[PDB]
Amino acid sequence: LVNNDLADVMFNRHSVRQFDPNVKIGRDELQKMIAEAATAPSACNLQSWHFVVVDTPEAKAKFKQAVMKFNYPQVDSASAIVFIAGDTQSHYVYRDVWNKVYEDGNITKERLDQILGTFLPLYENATPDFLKFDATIDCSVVGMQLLLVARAHGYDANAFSGIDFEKMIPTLGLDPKRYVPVMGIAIGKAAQEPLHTTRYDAKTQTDFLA
Amino acid sequence: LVNNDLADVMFNRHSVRQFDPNVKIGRDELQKMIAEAATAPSACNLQSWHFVVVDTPEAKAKFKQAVMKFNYPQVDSASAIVFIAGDTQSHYVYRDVWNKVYEDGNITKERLDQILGTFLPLYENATPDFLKFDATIDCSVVGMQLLLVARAHGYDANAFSGIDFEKMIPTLGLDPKRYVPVMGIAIGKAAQEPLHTTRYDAKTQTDFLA
C-alpha cells in the first residue's frame, strides 16, 4: 500500500476532478482496488454491487453518452472510471451459490433450506423499491471504500451521479430490468488542486435521544 | 487515533454484534467520531445525513421499539447506537446558510442567487423518490466512514437496517415527512469473535466496457 495512513487517506480526501491524462492504471491493479473495496459490509452479505470499468478512449466515448457534460473533465482525464450499479436480483445470485453446494451433495437439503431461510423470504418478497433501496446502500458503502482505496494506492478520485439515469444501464450493456445506476468513481493521479469544501458543524446534525 | 493502520482498520473490519456492556463512550468522543465520519463526500456537498445518538438505557428501551428482535443483542450491549437518517429537505438547509451569508452582507444578492442556482433548482425539481435516493447515498457513505472511524478509535461496530421502517423516525422524535430511516450503527468494545464471512471473487461482479 502506497498510503496506509488512515487519517491522511480519509481526512484529506477531496473530490479530484482533473487527472493526469498520461497516467494509466493496469487492469490488475484496478481489479485489486475493487476487490479491496468489496471488503465492505452489505445487508445479509448479498454484496449487491456491480462494477463496470471504463478505461479506454473507446469506452469513455460510449460511456459519455449517458454522462452529463459538466462531468466530462473527470471522465476524459481519468485513468479509469469504475461505474457502480446495484444488482436488484443479488438475492438470487446468493441463492444460486448455495443451491449448487447442495446439488454437489456437500450440504443436505435441510441445511440449504436453513441457509435460504435467513435471507430469501425477506428479499424474495421485497418490493422493487426496497430492493432498489438496499442495493443503493451496498453500492454506496463500497463506493465510499473505493474512494479511500484509490488514495491508499497513491491515486485520487471523484464520485459522481450527474448522469442520465434512464440511459446509463443500457449504455453500459447491462440489463435495465435488473441493475440500478448509482454512481461513477473516476480514478487517477491528481493533476489539479481539488476545490476546497467545508462541512457543517456536526452538532447541528446530531441529536441525543436521551 | 488509536488505530491509524488503514489496511487493518478496513480489511479486518467485521460486524461485531456483542459488545462489552460495561464499556462506555463519552459524548465528546461520540460527537468527534461523527464529525470525522462526516468528512464523507455528498452530492452538491448537501451532507444530507442526520444522527440520533442512543447511549443511555432509557434511550435504548425507547429505540428498541422500532428495531427488529434479532438486532436486540447489538442494541442491548453496545456503548452507543448512532442512528443515521436522511434529510430530504437538506437543500433548504444549505440554502438557509447562504441566505445568512447575505443577511450578514458579505455577499451580494446576485452571488446568492448564483450560489443558489447551482443546486436549489435541481433539488426542488426532483421527485421525492430521488431526494430519498440521494439522501440514502449520503447516509450510506457517512455510515461506511463511521464504521471505519469507530475501529480507528479502538472500537468495533455493526451496521443494521433490520428495523421497523414505519416506527423508527417517529420513535426518534423526527418529522416523518422530512427524514427517512437508513441505518443504525451500534458501537462498542467487542465481547464476541464476529461471524466469519466470505466475499465473491470480485471478477464475477466486474465488467470491462471496452
Ligand SMILES: Cc1cc2nc3c(=O)[nH]c(=O)nc-3n(C[C@H](O)[C@H](O)[C@H](O)COP(=O)(O)O)c2cc1C
Ligand atoms: C452521490 C454523490 C454524487 C456526486 N456527484 C458529483 C457530480 O455529479 N459531479 C461532481 O463534480 N461531483 C460529484 N460529487 C462530489 C461532491 O461534489 C463532493 O463530494 C462534495 O462537494 C464534497 O467535496 P469533497 O468530496 O471534495 O470533500 C458527488 C458526490 C456524491 C457522494
Ligand SMILES: Cc1cc2nc3c(=O)[nH]c(=O)nc-3n(C[C@H](O)[C@H](O)[C@H](O)COP(=O)(O)O)c2cc1C
Ligand atoms: C445496510 C446494512 C444493513 C445491515 N443490517 C444488519 C442487520 O440488520 N443485522 C445484522 O446482524 N447485521 C446487519 N448488517 C451487517 C451484515 O450482515 C454484514 O456486513 C455482512 O454479513 C458482512 O459481514 P461483515 O460485516 O462482518 O463483513 C447490515 C449491513 C449493512 C451494510
